[model samples]
Target: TCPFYKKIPGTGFTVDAFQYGVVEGCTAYFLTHFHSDHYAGLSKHFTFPVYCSEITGNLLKNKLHVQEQYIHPLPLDTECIVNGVKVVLLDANHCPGAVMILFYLPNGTVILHTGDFRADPSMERSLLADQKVHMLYLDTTYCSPEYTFPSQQEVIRFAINTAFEAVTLNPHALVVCGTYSIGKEKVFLAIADVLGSKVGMSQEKYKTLQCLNIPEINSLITTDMCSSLVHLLPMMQINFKGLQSHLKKCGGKYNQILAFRPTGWTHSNKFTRIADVIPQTKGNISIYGIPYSEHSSYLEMKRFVQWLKPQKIIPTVNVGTWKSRSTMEKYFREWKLEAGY
Candidate 1:
């Protein structure tokens, strides 16, 4: 019944353990990324060997305080054996250090767990060569047909152009971009490089990015608010209440404030967009929700599924009952038929 954790019948390996927290006596643990949700119950005291990308390993030791002894860094496209199971890490394209795991089991079954990723063309080529995938633990985050958003690159450009236009209209305006703790640094880094301005963020975020050793972010991030016209704030800080508090604190320091939230949810027909402004307002601030996402869109998912042709499809999120093997098969079959795949 535990949806987040995927377990192989006889094998002790587990992926994204949370509710059924870290199976005791397990062979090993594999983390797809460093996202809090995926790493819910993990801590410095973790005793077992945890395999992840080198960047994720660094984040574990530097950011999460997990000891280096337990963090096993796996290079991308390189194969390693853990408990006799052949494991390979592939780029997830969702965030830095994020990876899609390919597990070649003892029985010659190949399983893939797409931690969280967009439809990357390079990754498709790599997996296409594998010929067969026995099971696919899919990231169905944006599974609906309504979530057809533009490519990430296009969305980033749109956000940057929109922010510049807003500032042009009001010279003293503060262009704030919302981002997750780890992902979307590219958006802020591009803004900083293009606009020739430092980006402001919390001290904690600054340290995390610093530990990441991402050259683009190292020189641009600042904890000082005044040093930057474009502020790279947490995604949580872009809402109405958050903006109201921020505006109150700033007082007359800026003439206007425009916030951009790049996410796939903007693709919904109900979300109206007018010149990059999402129809929401809170005095002197305009918030825009752009159609940008790391997860694969419905069409992309269909293509991935059609290519892999997995014997079983396991939905990682919102997997309620319908936990049986045949139930999942029926579920995927119905979805494909409905989507005309």
Candidate 2:
């Protein structure tokens, strides 16, 4: 009930309304980002007024055809009022327009919904300097010790260098880098700047990049696949079947194909093999899973919670059943003990 769009006891507002069905009797609606999971039941047909970042609003309009009047663009690091409640938007560091929402109710209670964010030092400083928070809706995506990964900058360096080395080793090869539609634009931009070459992308992706208005990025996008050394592709496009079909068509011209997947799951010891570079080969195609993540690790989460020191922590994800709450509580308790709070 806490994170899934439930109302505050005294105040009447909803945040990220997906699992709660239609947002009835709520004063206002707040959207954190454009992730499908966060906006599950939302669509262009949505009539209610919604608040989100300008970039997110643009995505909603362009992608979902949501009417511009229904979506309100809330500028980052700025405060505004929505249905009598004071609210501020802070950068979430997860994506281009993702934001952490801070709400100040009429009763003097401060609530923070960290809408899918990582522990950024600057954001931590800004929040710590502000007033204390009464409730914290947390993004506990990787709230376990087993989920550890390097910083995004470190991983980007690794990916760029790895791609360059692969291309150098096989001069006639095409290096394909896997990325999400919005989250990993930086990785592709970095590769383009460093390699001094354009990165090929699909027509839809090219259009999305154009909206960002980055001069470097705008000049680097190309629809012609064979014209560039590195191809920026959606993460789903890196799988065996997709690559097989792609190679079947272009394999004769290009001698080798190297694919690099930069994601947090690459470091997951529980599900997959944990390594910096896990390579798989099929004929002339080679795929490497690189350890890159946008979310905070276990230690980082503990540190962030300790710094904020909220009265109570409401986990964002669904815990399981009776045992789920207990499990999450145990994890929080352990984190507090380890963080010396």
Candidate 3:
């Protein structure tokens, strides 16, 4: 939410108008990310003039097909006025199009709204560096110590290595992976880095790789133009399970196949109990797991909450709402005694 104070629907009390749900006097709206929980209301009921980063705007139109005239596109740190509200976009580093929105109100209030985020230790010093934020709406999805894990890059490496081993063991095997379309593209690049000149990427993969600024990495090879002799092949195909039986009998080096869902591959362990009802892979197939996550950790969220010190904080996203809200309340109670909240 922004520092542009306005009444939010159902809250009764006024808050920064850029929060979730409808706002009665919201002169302008700002979106921090393209996740469903944050943007579900924008295209359906709320028609308020909205502002977000350019990449995020393209994501909304191309991915969700939202048709709001006020879907204004602005870049990081570029201050712009919309519906009489001043807004700036900051790098969130959670997803390809994710951003942290900073709002400068006419009343001299500055609020920072961090959509989902992870602790990139290198960026910790600069997270909210220059701005003196009056309030912060933080992401607390993983507020418990039990949720601790390694960095995203390390997780991607693990997933790629696992997949490579699986492919190497059975050259004719079929592999199925799952990840989100936008964020998981990094894993694909990581896989290509492992395969080097042998990697083949699909058209969709090529387009996504282009968006990433690492031209030297992306220029390695495109799947459409790959040589057949290499151990890797990129098929712009979907539904690996349905084709498993036929692909197994193709009787060539091409028989070895790898497929993955854009997202949700890493969280497969939590859903093992429900896997029976969901879907299963066929014969000679391998399903690998990765630990890449786009959300902030428990301590990171706590640290951010301490930095901004808002009067009240509400959580967004399904995984964070209930658990994170409880953690925030506990932290606030202890801090109030010391800081006089």
Model 3 steric clash total: 9
- Candidate-wise lDDT, in order: 0.75, 0.75, 0.55
| Candidate 1 structure quality by residue, lDDT tens digits, 1-341 | 44434775556788877446557656787889889988887778777888888888888898878998998898888878888877889888888889999888888888888988886657667844756888888887766666666677777777678777677778788878887758877777776666778888778877788766576565788898877888877788899888777766666788677887776566353454333444356778888777667788777877778766677777786455455444545657976676564
lDDT score at residue 19, model 2, on the 0-100 scale: 57
Q: Tens-digit lDDT track for model 3 on 103-126?
A: 667677776667767755544466
| Candidate 2 vs. true structure, TM-score | 0.90
* Candidate 2 residue lDDT tens string, 73-116: 88777779888778889888887788888889898989888888
TM-score against truth, every candidate: 0.88, 0.90, 0.68
Residue 231 local lDDT, model 1: 82
The 10 consecutive residues of candidate 1 with the worst lDDT sum are: 269-278
| Candidate 3 lDDT | 0.55
* Cα lDDT for residue 192, candidate 1: 66
